[PDB]
Design an enzyme around this catalytic site. Structure first.
Site, PDB file in Angstrom:
ATOM      1  N   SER A 188       0.819  -1.210   0.000  1.00 55.06           N
ATOM      2  CA  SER A 188       0.000   0.000   0.000  1.00 55.06           C
ATOM      3  C   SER A 188       0.847   1.251   0.000  1.00 55.06           C
ATOM      4  O   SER A 188       1.728   1.424   0.840  1.00 55.06           O
ATOM      5  CB  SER A 188      -1.007   0.082   1.174  1.00 55.06           C
ATOM      6  OG  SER A 188      -2.048   1.018   0.866  1.00 55.06           O
ATOM      7  N   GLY A 189       0.650   2.139  -0.990  1.00 54.27           N
ATOM      8  CA  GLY A 189       1.453   3.341  -1.147  1.00 54.27           C
ATOM      9  C   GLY A 189       2.652   3.072  -2.011  1.00 54.27           C
ATOM     10  O   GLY A 189       3.719   3.659  -1.836  1.00 54.27           O
ATOM     11  N   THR A 233      -1.597   3.624  -8.185  1.00 51.18           N
ATOM     12  CA  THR A 233      -2.553   4.610  -8.649  1.00 51.18           C
ATOM     13  C   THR A 233      -1.774   5.572  -9.508  1.00 51.18           C
ATOM     14  O   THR A 233      -2.225   5.965 -10.581  1.00 51.18           O
ATOM     15  CB  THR A 233      -3.250   5.361  -7.512  1.00 51.18           C
ATOM     16  OG1 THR A 233      -3.791   4.461  -6.533  1.00 51.18           O
ATOM     17  CG2 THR A 233      -4.404   6.223  -8.044  1.00 51.18           C
ATOM     18  N   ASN A 237       1.054   2.296   5.821  1.00 54.90           N
ATOM     19  CA  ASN A 237       1.339   3.530   5.116  1.00 54.90           C
ATOM     20  C   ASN A 237       0.322   4.567   5.554  1.00 54.90           C
ATOM     21  O   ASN A 237      -0.837   4.245   5.805  1.00 54.90           O
ATOM     22  CB  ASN A 237       1.267   3.297   3.576  1.00 54.90           C
ATOM     23  CG  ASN A 237       2.032   4.367   2.806  1.00 54.90           C
ATOM     24  OD1 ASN A 237       3.265   4.372   2.788  1.00 54.90           O
ATOM     25  ND2 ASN A 237       1.305   5.302   2.155  1.00 54.90           N
ATOM     26  N   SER A 273      -3.304   5.191   2.784  1.00 50.15           N
ATOM     27  CA  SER A 273      -3.644   3.851   2.337  1.00 50.15           C
ATOM     28  C   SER A 273      -5.087   3.816   1.888  1.00 50.15           C
ATOM     29  O   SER A 273      -5.979   4.409   2.497  1.00 50.15           O
ATOM     30  CB  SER A 273      -3.447   2.816   3.480  1.00 50.15           C
ATOM     31  OG  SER A 273      -3.653   1.466   3.042  1.00 50.15           O
ATOM     32  N   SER A 274      -5.360   3.037   0.826  1.00 52.71           N
ATOM     33  CA  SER A 274      -6.683   2.800   0.278  1.00 52.71           C
ATOM     34  C   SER A 274      -7.413   1.673   0.951  1.00 52.71           C
ATOM     35  O   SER A 274      -6.863   0.597   1.168  1.00 52.71           O
ATOM     36  CB  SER A 274      -6.690   2.570  -1.254  1.00 52.71           C
ATOM     37  OG  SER A 274      -6.248   3.756  -1.916  1.00 52.71           O
ATOM     38  N   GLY A 311      -2.744  -5.241  -1.640  1.00 50.72           N
ATOM     39  CA  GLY A 311      -2.048  -6.523  -1.549  1.00 50.72           C
ATOM     40  C   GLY A 311      -2.208  -7.154  -0.186  1.00 50.72           C
ATOM     41  O   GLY A 311      -3.069  -6.757   0.590  1.00 50.72           O
ATOM     42  N   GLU A 318      -2.046  -7.678   3.623  1.00 45.83           N
ATOM     43  CA  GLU A 318      -2.034  -6.717   4.702  1.00 45.83           C
ATOM     44  C   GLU A 318      -1.924  -7.441   6.020  1.00 45.83           C
ATOM     45  O   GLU A 318      -2.873  -8.064   6.491  1.00 45.83           O
ATOM     46  CB  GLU A 318      -3.321  -5.833   4.650  1.00 45.83           C
ATOM     47  CG  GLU A 318      -3.372  -4.686   5.699  1.00 45.83           C
ATOM     48  CD  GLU A 318      -4.495  -3.674   5.479  1.00 45.83           C
ATOM     49  OE1 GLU A 318      -4.390  -2.866   4.519  1.00 45.83           O
ATOM     50  OE2 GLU A 318      -5.459  -3.605   6.290  1.00 45.83           O
TER      51      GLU A 318
END
Ligand code: ADP
Ligand code: MG
Lengths: 367, 701
Positions: free
Chosen positions: B149-150, B154, B196, B199-200, B455, B457
């Site tokens: 994440s990060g 994106t 992060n 994070s999404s 991904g 986590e």
């Protein structure tokens, strides 16, 4: 890393790591199977609840203490005590600790053998030692001499220790306290119209053995002041709302420790086991056994002991001799504070039985 | 010839063999008297013939393993060769700085219409490859961007959309709305996690549609796996959603006194987790005293390289006017977000005539008045709807009446929490439907999907949502085992080269352990809500009760780790996955799986006077209630069968389309240029299947 102090009481089994502070786990010992048919079907309810949850389930289980007269009920239930404590209480790993187990000062074989062997083969502990509950109370006192009292449910003992070995010819085991005091309280509480015959419910009696009993300054004179009844009658409240007024029987029950003929045993009281063990010790050494009478265990926490014991021993003990009865704080955890002092003390880590030495000898030569 | 020795600071270091025997392999480091220890087979990997060579594609590296793959990436990190072909999988490393060659328009114009492998590895070498299958076999292609994440999934996604709008027509009418609107939807769904800061907490899926001649006809962005469980419990260092901290921080006092907003510490869905704002020194002094929480007065602003909550509120509202959202409609969007805040402040109690029912607390009287002003449904009618179970006798006879049976206090709190997750679910679907409206598609044929989802986590405190995220990664990796390993070895024997149709180490027994009926973990959790007196201890003990032994799972007591030594039987469970063994703690599992409404809350929020609230609950969710329609469906539903339906529906769109394999690797934890961690970078190669794919493919050639 650190050693694990496990005291095999009948209480109040006590568990806590080796120093620097108080036991982490105290619990009412019991295993209990569910004694009614489960029509809700549970779901998935326990086969055996151990304590503490087996004391949250009174009236719906049949409580069985894991040791009975200082001997195991069977090692099938004893192992559930062990497994439950290490995994589901303490959160300690079996192979990460030297352990310390306790036993009674006089207990028959193979109760220490079978124990030592089963815990070594089942939990695979890397080192072990077994201390008598009285010797650990000497370390707790800090004195180097004296007669030691491990009075716990269901076996009391009177062990004399003199710098720094045990005296073989004066060790007395009396089976007077404390489970017979629980059962006796249940036998004289019926005298006021109550009933407690149910095994689980006997615990409610044990709780009244704790709080409201009191030892007399003298039997004959408390019986006198009983004839002037008022302050003796104290009102207890019982978990279903019932209010119990005990008075004469209130001082009668603890009074048992002096003149135990009331229970049914022919052996004499704490009084005489103290005197008769001292008067089997040599004349010269007796001088320092006097005034090093050291009490221990939770069943000495009744109010009126030790100053009943003091006045009675002081009356029979030699003239112009010093007799003070030494009663520490928090005696129920005395034994444990003993175990803590022992396993923390340098260099006696190398006086334990380690796994390599156990592998060589198995259940042989336990001395 | 030397080998590779595992080192703590390098991951893998060079070293010779100076004493040899199985389980006693003494490895001496290269010209170093350091870790002169002994090893095992899984601690020794061979090295190449020479160390002075670095390669574009790893097809030229004969002693290929994880130490020779992390060493080829360590050298190409130095030379700024971030894009690297691994088998048929793109590995991209985030450099965290501006490099002119990747931003050159000549780089896109050179690569324009060029075959994979006859030109250097690049981001545009994957976007041309999932366009040549439209002309060869005539098949739609799904771009799947994976990675930590990060990690730039994106930002590298905007390079892929820029290649499609430059080499295969000019594409869709106006691109830049997609670029502008991603931080907008990340206000709504991004949060702060231990992995992060930015994070999404959702899985967006872009669907660029085309036609028969392969020309773009429009777009559609949707979303999968929305973390609605963040609403009820935030965490300890984690936040909730980033829209509440972007709305109370800088906005007017003739909007905050009117929406009755206040400092973060007053609201229930903000009473756990981190209440601090992301800011910088000028933006921090622009925050007024009444907008600060006690934690902000104590510890001030949070630190992130790009997030500024007070800065981003202007770039949020500028991006709203760029997707066509009216300022009065932004005020109706502010009334729904503020209505969730005054819905959370309903505190319940017992009492009343029923005795076993539920009522509300006196202190939630000023808060219930602001809730009925924002939602468009009355306060008296919401108080006898949150607390009751409506049912009827009309279906059973012409003596019909509609009775009410008051709920418990915990079921009032779970119904209020389910009503709060229901409003934010339909509010997030309304924002993506407002953006979807401006680029609709006409007569679709082929289409190019672009996935952007988290991904593996795992950290210090894992829960239910980390198990749904790690299970979705376990389903994608079994998809990759039949699309990267089974499919590619059919192609080496279609050129007559060789290689056998060798099988992989499957995980089908683990798949039929999490989502399997009767004995699965999610089928025992979904049964827990149906039980009276539900408990996390009864659900955790029910897994170990149903199967005593099974190598894919174990309880914390049976784990040898020190962290699990302090966790009891009834406090969690450990699943062994492709990325290792991950413990998920159990607590609040009953309410996390609960997310449903019955008719008494549905025939009030759907039928709202406010057209906007009524449009959030759009048709067919909004429906007329009338006589004998004729059954009380769908009742419980649950988060676990919401997630199993929406995960298996994306599997039918992946099994039916072609695909591109992209992995984005983060080289350092602080997100800056020229720093190679080596051990954290190794964990992104070990939690992405890279070791297993680069051992199965090698064989006799
Ligand atoms: N305040 C008290 N007064 C009287 N008896 C007590 C009191 N507290 C505990 N006890 C008794 O002491 C017993 C616990 O003694 P303990 O020291 O644990 O013996 P052991 O260590 O041998 O198990 C309990 O069975 C209880 O009946
Ligand atoms: Mg004892």
């Amino acid at each position: 890393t650190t050693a694990l102090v496990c005291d095999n009481g009948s209480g109040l089994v006590k568990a806590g790591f080796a120093g620097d502070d108080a036991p982490r786990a105290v619990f009412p010992s019991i295993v209990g199977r569910p004694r009614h048919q489960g029509v809700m079907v549970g779901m998935g309810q326990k086969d055996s609840y151990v304590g503490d949850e087996a004391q949250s389930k009174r009236g719906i289980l049949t409580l069985k203490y894991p040791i009975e007269h200082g001997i195991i009920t069977n090692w099938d239930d004893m192992e559930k005590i062990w497994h439950h404590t290490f995994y589901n209480e303490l959160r300690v790993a079996p192979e990460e600790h030297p352990t310390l187990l306790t036993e009674a000062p006089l207990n028959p074989k193979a109760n220490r053998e079978k124990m030592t062997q089963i815990m070594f083969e089942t939990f695979n502990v890397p080192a072990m030692y077994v201390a008598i509950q009285a010797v650990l109370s000497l370390y707790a006192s800090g004195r180097t001499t004296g007669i030691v009292l491990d009075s716990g449910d269901g076996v009391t003992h009177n062990v004399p220790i003199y710098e720094g070995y045990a005296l073989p010819h004066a060790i007395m085991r009396l089976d007077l306290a404390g489970r017979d005091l629980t059962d006796y309280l249940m036998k004289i509480l019926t005298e006021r119209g109550y009933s407690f015959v149910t095994t689980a419910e006997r615990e409610i009696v044990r709780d009244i053995k704790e709080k409201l009993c009191y030892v007399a300054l003298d039997f004959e004179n408390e019986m006198a002041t009983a004839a002037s009844s008022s302050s003796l009658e104290k009102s207890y409240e019982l978990p279903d709302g019932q209010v119990i007024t005990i008075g004469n029987e209130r001082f009668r029950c603890p009074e048992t420790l002096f003149q135990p003929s009331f229970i049914g045993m022919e052996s004499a009281g704490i009084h005489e086991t103290t005197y008769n063990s001292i008067m089997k010790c040599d004349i010269d050494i007796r001088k320092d056994l006097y005034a090093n009478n050291v009490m221990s265990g939770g069943t000495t926490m009744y109010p009126g002991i030790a100053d009943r014991m003091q006045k009675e021993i002081t009356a029979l003990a030699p003239s112009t001799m010093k007799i003070k009865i030494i009663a520490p704080p928090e005696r129920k955890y005395s034994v444990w504070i003993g175990g803590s002092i022992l396993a923390s003390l340098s260099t006696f880590q190398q006086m334990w039985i380690t796994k390599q030495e156990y592998d060589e000898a198995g259940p042989s030569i336990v001395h | 010839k030397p080998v590779w020795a595992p080192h703590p600071t390098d991951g893998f270091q060079v070293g010779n063999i100076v004493d040899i025997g199985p389980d006693s392999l003494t490895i001496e480091p290269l010209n170093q008297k350091g870790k002169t220890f002994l090893a095992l087979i899984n601690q020794v990997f061979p090295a190449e013939e020479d160390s002075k060579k670095d390669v574009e594609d790893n097809c030229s590296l004969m002693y290929l393993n994880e130490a020779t793959l992390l060493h080829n990436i360590k050298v190409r990190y130095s030379k700024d060769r971030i894009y690297t072909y691994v088998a048929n999988i793109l590995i991209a490393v985030n450099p965290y700085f501006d490099i002119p060659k990747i931003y050159s328009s000549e780089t896109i114009k050179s690569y324009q219409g060029k075959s994979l492998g006859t030109m250097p590895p690049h981001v545009f070498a994957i976007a041309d490859k999932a366009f040549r299958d439209m002309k060869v076999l005539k098949l739609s292609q799904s771009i799947i961007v994976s990675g930590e994440s990060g990690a730039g999934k994106t930002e590298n996604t905007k390079f892929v959309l820029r290649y499609l709008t430059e080499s295969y027509g000019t594409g869709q009418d106006i691109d830049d709305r997609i670029v502008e609107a991603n931080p907008l939807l990340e206000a709504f769904g991004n949060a702060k996690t231990v992995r992060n800061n930015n994070s999404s907490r959702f899985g967006k899926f872009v669907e660029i549609h085309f036609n028969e001649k392969s020309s773009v006809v429009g777009g559609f962005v949707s979303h999968y796996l929305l973390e609605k469980s963040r609403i009820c419990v935030q965490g300890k260092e984690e936040r909730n959603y980033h829209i509440f901290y972007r709305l109370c921080a800088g906005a007017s006092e003739d909007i905050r006194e009117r929406l009755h907003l206040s400092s973060p510490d007053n609201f229930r869905y903000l009473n756990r987790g981190c209440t601090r704002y992301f800011a910088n020194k000028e933006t921090d002094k622009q925050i007024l005293q009444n907008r600060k929480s006690p934690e902000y007065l104590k510890a001030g602003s949070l630190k992130d390289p790009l997030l500024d909550d007070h800065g981003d509120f202007i770039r949020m509202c500028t991006a709203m006017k760029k997707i066509g959202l009216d300022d009065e409609e932004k005020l109706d969007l502010f009334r729904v977000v503020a209505g969730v805040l005054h819905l959370g402040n309903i505190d319940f109690e017992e009492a009343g005539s029923t005795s076993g029912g539920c009522n509300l607390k006196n202190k939630s009287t000023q808060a219930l008045e602001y809730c009925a002003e924002l939602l468009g449904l009355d306060q008296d009618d919401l108080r006898v709807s949150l607390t009751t179970r409506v049912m009827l006798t009309t279906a059973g006879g012409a003596k019909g009446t509609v009775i009410k049976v008051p709920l418990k206090v915990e079921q009032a709190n779970n119904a209020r929490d389910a009503l709060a997750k229901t409003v934010y679910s339909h509010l997030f679907d309304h924002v993506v439907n407002r953006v979807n409206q401006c680029f609709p598609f006409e007569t679709s044929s082929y289409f190019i999907g672009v996935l952007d989802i988290a991904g593996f986590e795992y950290f210090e405190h894992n829960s239910f949502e980390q198990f749904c995220i790690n299970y979705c990664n376990e389903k994608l990796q079994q998809f990759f085992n039949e699309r990267i390993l089974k499919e590619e070895q059919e192609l080496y024997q279609k050129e007559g080269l060789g290689v056998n149709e060798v099988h992989y180490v499957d995980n089908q027994d683990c798949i039929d352990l999490i989502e399997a009926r009767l004995v699965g973990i999610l089928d025992i959790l979904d049964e827990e809500n149906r039980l009276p007196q539900p408990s996390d201890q009864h659900f955790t003990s029910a897994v170990h009760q149903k199967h005593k032994d099974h190598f894919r799972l174990s309880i914390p007591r049976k784990s040898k780790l020190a962290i699990h030594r302090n966790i009891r039987d009834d406090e969690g469970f450990i699943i062994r996955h492709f990325a290792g063994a991950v413990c998920y703690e159990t607590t609040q599992f009953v309410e996390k799986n609960n997310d449903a409404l019955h008719m008494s809350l549905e025939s009030l929020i759907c039928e709202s006077r406010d057209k906007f609230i009524r449009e959030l609950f759009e048709s067919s969710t909004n429906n007329n209630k009338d006589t004998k329609q004729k059954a009380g469906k769908l009742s419980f539903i649950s988060v676990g069968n919401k997630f199993k339906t929406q995960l298996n529906l994306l599997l039918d769109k992946l099994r039916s389309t072609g695909a591109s394999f992209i992995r984005c690797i983060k080289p350092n934890l602080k997100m800056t240029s020229h720093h190679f961690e080596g051990a954290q970078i190794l964990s992104q190669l070990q939690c992405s299947g890279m070791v297993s794919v680069l051992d199965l493919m090698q064989g006799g050639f």
